[PDB]
């Protein structure tokens, strides 16, 4: 069947911010380069994948404090102003990008394109939850965030693929367990989960996660190849029985607290309390509020992008 497309909104509109010139502006002079690029990406995806179901996954909290509680360095270098309790921290975002996110969200709401979020969770968690739950159609997760390669799945069906944006949407291809295993050396039979365990061990500087000192990606791969899983690796270390080297034992035992804390940080949540802005995840074939869509698109200088999206929708069987 047609795939359901699950879109990592922030990954995509950050990409369009940096991929479309800032001289693309609304009639009031505000840049709309990210708005244009993001709407154009939806149209490209609709044409390429021909989905019947599409969801733009939101970051109701781009840096959940429950992750920060576990590893305080998590995303810390990207915070402009920390906010207390459940108020999301102020992310360091260009001043001319923040209004464009508001424009995008306004357009999506007026059009009736499904968006989904979960309070105190990232879009990453919405994606993992909607991917894990899906029972009817193959899933395509659209993102440039490599940590989401942990979602790849073949069985149990339906399959999950990541349309990885690291080189842009035009060059993007679909990653499954095979591709993740081939590129990161994790075992095929549990490539997605093993990828998250490799990423935990080796670290993720972009997310502020140091990893385990002395266990780089090569060592992490060989230990997963030999012991199968992170849990088995820790077992081998806590257990003078095994053929684990004393050096690897020391490095792992010296990081038991970090490893336990990082597991829940690195893994996307799969049971997040996702809610939708729409009654279903069906992609509307025309704007739910066409007058408001036309007025917003004119005000935001993306009338032709919206028109091209409606042409893409019109060609769906």
Nearest to Mn ion of 126, 223 (CB atom):
126
Residue 229 tokens, joined:
């899983």
Nearest to Mn ion of 154, 204 (CB atom):
204
Residues in the site for Mn ion, rule: CB under 5 A?
65, 82-83, 89, 122-124, 145, 147
In the block, which residue shows the tokens 């769906």?
316
Is 142 in a helix, a strand, or coil?
A: strand
In the block, which residue shows the tokens 């270098």?
77
The strand pair at 4-8 and 139-143 is best described as parallel
Q: Least CB distance from residue 10 to Mn ion, whole Å?
A: 5
Closest to 42 in 3D by CA, of 113, 131, 144: 113
The strand pair at 174-175 and 160-164 is best described as antiparallel
Beta-bridged to residue 54, according to DSSP, are 5
* CB atoms inside a 10 Å sphere around CB 28: 9
Q: Least CB distance from residue 28 to Mn ion, whole Å?
A: 30
Nearest to Mn ion of 82, 273 (CB atom):
82
Q: Least CB distance from residue 225 to Mn ion, whole Å?
A: 26
Q: Least CB distance from residue 175 to Mn ion, whole Å?
A: 16
Nearest to Mn ion of 60, 122 (CB atom):
122
Is 51 in a helix, a strand, or coil?
A: coil
Residue 210 tokens, joined:
């140091």
Q: Least CB distance from residue 57 to Mn ion, whole Å?
A: 9
Nearest to Mn ion of 17, 300 (CB atom):
17
């Amino acid at each position: 069947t047609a795939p359901i497309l699950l879109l990592d909104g922030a990954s995509m509109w950050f990409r369009s911010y940096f991929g479309v010139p800032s001289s693309i502006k609304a009639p009031d002079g505000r840049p709309v380069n990210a708005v244009r690029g993001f709407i154009d990406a939806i149209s490209t995806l609709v044409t390429r994948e021909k989905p019947r179901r599409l969801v733009v996954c939101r970051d109701d909290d781009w840096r959940p404090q429950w992750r920060v509680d576990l590893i305080p360095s998590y995303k810390a270098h990207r915070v402009a102003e920390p906010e207390p309790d459940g108020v999301p921290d102020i992310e360091e975002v260009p001043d001319d990008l923040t209004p464009q996110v508001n424009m995008i969200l306004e357009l999506l709401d007026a059009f009736g394109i499904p968006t989904a979020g979960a309070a105190g969770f990232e879009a990453d968690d919405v994606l993992g939850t909607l991917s894990a739950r899906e029972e009817r159609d193959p899933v395509v997760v659209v993102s440039g965030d490599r940590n989401l390669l942990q979602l790849v799945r073949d069985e149990p069906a339906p399959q999950v693929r990541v349309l990885y944006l690291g080189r842009g949407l035009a060059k993007a291809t679909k990653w499954g367990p095979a591709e993740v295993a081939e590129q990161y050396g994790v075992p095929l039979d549990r490539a997605g989960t093993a990828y998250a365990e490799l990423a935990l061990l080796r670290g993720d500087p972009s997310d502020g996660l140091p990893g385990v000192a002395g266990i780089g990606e090569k060592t992490a791969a060989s230990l997963l190849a030999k012991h199968g899983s992170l849990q088995n690796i820790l077992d081998a270390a806590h257990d003078p029985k095994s053929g684990l080297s004393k050096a690897h034992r020391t490095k792992l035992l010296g990081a038991v607290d970090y490893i336990a804390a990082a597991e829940t940080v690195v893994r996307v949540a799969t049971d997040a309390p996702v809610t939708f802005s729409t009654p279903t995840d069906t992609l509307p074939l025309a704007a739910g509020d066409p007058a408001r869509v036309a007025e917003l698109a004119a005000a935001y200088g993306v009338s032709s992008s919206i028109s091209r999206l409606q042409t893409a929708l019109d060609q769906l069987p």
